[PDB]
């Protein structure tokens, strides 16, 4: 069977907590007043929820209301408990309220509002300095979450809200987040295709916070190389092949052999043999202003097959890429 794995940081944080911290099934939802909120505009529908722009008629503050769909069930209390555990943390979206929607009869999570610009438009305008700046902001959120025993599991541009006017960033949509418990086996069917770490793509269930560090690297690669998405697979299988065409097959085999993981045999006809590519291969006149030796080295240390070998969020924050960022 597979060789086990543990996080190399924040390994045992949940074990020292009161049971109530991580045993979200027992949580008792505090409810506020639904009549405080007036829906203004439907913004999106996700797999699990309908999102609205709303107004809190009390203090006239704009808010976001996510009306949760009767999904698997227990994810309601997981998301609520994680949001309450992380509330107040750096760059973590604030859960302002929980109300019972009278139409859906389901919980509606009320969040602080962030004035965001569609990442498809925004990323085209980020300067080198801005990429560094906002990456550092994301890292603050991830390190906080990880330090609190939580992995986000769905880091992607759509879940990073940026008010670019005010240089304000929030990491949102904690509905796939989980508590990290050493030795626990998790569902690999998390995250969006283009941001899934190799551990998910090879069906390795004993993963950890380092999953989010891969996702962050996939975001960074798309930003500095102006290639959206960077790893552009047609499905979850081709997704791995797209990674292997960059990182090479030999290191992929070393990774699965380390954990005594066997690839799905359907890779035999599609994976092929690929060398590791030098990152320079992706640099060209249109992205060159976003690339630097520091950016490439940082990226290289995030995008590793072996989840144990990737930089942690705190290690990332130490990297030379961020020396130019004022703090």
Swiss-Prot record:
Keywords assigned: Apoptosis, ATP-binding, Biological rhythms, Cell cycle, Disease variant, Intellectual disability, Kinase, Nucleotide-binding, Nucleus, Phosphoprotein, Serine/threonine-protein kinase, Transcription, Transcription regulation, Transferase, Wnt signaling pathway
One of the record's GO molecular function terms: ATP binding
Signal peptide: none
Known tissue expression: Expressed in gastric carcinoma tissue and the expression gradually increases with the progression of the carcinoma (at protein level).
Transmembrane parts of this sequence: none
Keyword Nucleotide-binding found: yes
BP term (GO), one: positive regulation of protein catabolic process
Any one of the GO CC terms: cytosol
Domain Protein kinase: 37-322
Regulation affecting activity: Constitutively active protein kinase whose activity is not directly affected by phosphorylation. Seems to be regulated by level of expression and localization.
Record has Aminoacyl-tRNA synthetase as a keyword: no
Family recorded in the similarity comment: Belongs to the protein kinase superfamily. Ser/Thr protein kinase family. CK2 subfamily.
Something else known: Can use both ATP and GTP as phosphoryl donors. Phosphorylation by casein kinase 2 has been estimated to represent up to one quarter of the eukaryotic phosphoproteome. Casein kinase 2 has been found to be increased at protein level and up-regulated at the level of enzyme activity in the majority of cancers. However, elevated levels of casein kinase 2 are present in certain normal organs such as brain and testes.
Task of the protein: Catalytic subunit of a constitutively active serine/threonine-protein kinase complex that phosphorylates a large number of substrates containing acidic residues C-terminal to the phosphorylated serine or threonine. Regulates numerous cellular processes, such as cell cycle progression, apoptosis and transcription, as well as viral infection. May act as a regulatory node which integrates and coordinates numerous signals leading to an appropriate cellular response.
Name of the protein described by the UniProt record: Casein kinase II subunit alpha
Naturally occurring in which organism (per UniProt): Homo sapiens
Positions spanned in the full protein: 3 to 329 of 391
């Amino acid at each position: 069977g597979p060789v086990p794995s543990r996080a190399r940081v924040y390994t045992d944080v949940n074990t020292h907590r009161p049971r109530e911290y991580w045993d979200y099934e027992s949580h008792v939802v505090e409810w506020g007043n639904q009549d405080d909120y007036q829906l203004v505009r439907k913004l999106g529908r996700g797999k699990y929820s309908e999102v609205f722009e709303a107004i809190n008629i009390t203090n006239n503050e704009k808010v976001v209301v996510k009306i949760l769909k009767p999904v698997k069930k227990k994810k309601i209390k997981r998301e609520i408990k994680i949001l309450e555990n992380l509330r107040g943390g750096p760059n973590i979206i604030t859960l302002a309220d929980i109300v019972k929607d009278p139409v859906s009869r389901t919980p509606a999570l009320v969040f602080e509002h962030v004035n965001n610009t569609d990442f498809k438009q925004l990323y085209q305008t980020l300067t080198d300095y801005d990429i560094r700046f906002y990456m550092y902001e994301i890292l603050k959120a991830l390190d906080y979450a990880h330090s609190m025993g939580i992995m986000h599991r769905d880091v992607k541009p759509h879940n990073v809200m940026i008010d670019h006017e005010h240089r304000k960033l929030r990491l949102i949509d904690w509905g796939l987040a989980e508590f990290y418990h050493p030795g626990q086996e998790y569902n690999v069917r998390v995250a969006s295709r283009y941001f899934k770490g190799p551990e998910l793509l090879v069906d390795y269930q004993m993963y950890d916070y380092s999953l989010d560090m891969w996702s962050l690297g996939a975001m960074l690669a798309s930003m500095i190389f102006r290639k959206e998405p960077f790893f552009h697979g047609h499905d979850n299988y081709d997704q791995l092949v797209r990674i292997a065409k960059v990182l090479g097959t030999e290191d992929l085999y070393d990774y699965i052999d380390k954990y005594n993981i066997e690839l799905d045999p359907r890779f035999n006809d599609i994976l092929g043999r690929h060398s590791r590519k030098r990152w320079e291969r992706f640099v060209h006149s249109e992205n060159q202003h976003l690339v630097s030796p520091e950016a490439l080295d940082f990226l290289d240390k995030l995008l590793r097959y072996d989840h144990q070998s990737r930089l942690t969020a705190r290690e990332a924050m130490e990297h030379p890429y961020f020396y130019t960022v004022v703090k």
